[PDB]
């Protein structure tokens, strides 16, 4: 879609 | 359709930009099979090691990660002055990019100056602590056998010898003639 120079995170893992 | 815009226009912007003041590195030789970037570090006998190129991963700047997908808009949703039917080509004033290159240079020299200055001092400068044990009676304090610790030699003498392209000074065992020391000193 839109350009994004960066890791495109969505999840968060708990320790 | 867009190939002329690339070859016969954008190429010149690359050729200019490569001559810009701050574009100082050699980025690529055109040979994917063999090219590696020249690698440098600021480095000190005292133990500093600051690589110029390093891999720290994604940064706040947003320059490190490359979306290659950018090629698509470039092919399929960009206009160019060459395509199409006539549009005047712009030849940018050198003065703007030049003057900002220069202001960046002075901003850097001013920025690195305090570190360059404190470190000049912390180094102790171009001199070494030196004991002079006296071999005889009625010897002046200046007279004797000059000697220094190896740490001082490393910090101050050694890199200079390296830089002057001369053989490293000889070690002196218990079986060292004065003539050998003379040959070493003249070397």
């Amino acid at each position: 879609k839109v350009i994004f120079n960066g890791l495109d995170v969505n999840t968060e893992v708990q320790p | 359709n867009i190939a002329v815009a690339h070859t016969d226009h954008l190429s010149v912007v690359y050729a200019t930009m490569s001559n810009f003041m701050l574009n100082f590195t050699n980025n690529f030789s055109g040979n994917h099979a063999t090219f590696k970037p020249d690698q440098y570090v600021i480095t000190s006998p005292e133990g500093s090691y600051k690589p110029i190129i390093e891999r720290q991963g994604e940064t706040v700047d947003g320059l490190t990660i490359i979306d290659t997908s950018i090629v698509w808009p470039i092919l399929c949703q960009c206009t160019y002055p060459l395509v199409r039917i006539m549009e005047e080509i712009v030849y940018p004033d050198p003065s703007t990019t030049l003057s900002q290159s220069l202001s960046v240079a002075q901003v850097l020299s001013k920025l690195t100056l305090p570190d360059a200055f404190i470190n000049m001092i912390l180094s102790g400068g171009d001199s070494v602590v030196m004991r002079t044990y006296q071999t005889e009676a009625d010897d002046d304090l200046d007279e004797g056998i000059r000697m220094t610790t190896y740490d001082q030699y490393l910090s101050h003498i050694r890199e200079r010898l390296h830089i002057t392209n001369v053989p490293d000074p000889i070690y002196i065992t218990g079986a060292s003639t004065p003539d050998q020391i003379a040959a070493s000193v003249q070397a």
Binding site: - | I42, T43, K110, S155
Partner: protein, 49 residues
């Protein structure tokens, strides 16, 4: 004192690791090419400027 914006100098600014400060100490430092092992090479006029 000299009106320099020294912000982030000497620091890695990582997206996930946050800011990290490295030592600004580098007394008697020289610019030197390193072998890809990471080890320093002696200055060579033949290749180094």
């Amino acid at each position: 004192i000299t009106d320099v914006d020294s912000t982030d100098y000497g620091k890695l600014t990582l997206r996930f690791l946050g800011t990290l400060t490295r030592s600004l100490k580098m007394q008697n430092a020289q610019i030197r090419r390193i072998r890809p092992d990471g080890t320093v090479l002696r200055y060579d006029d033949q290749i180094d400027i």
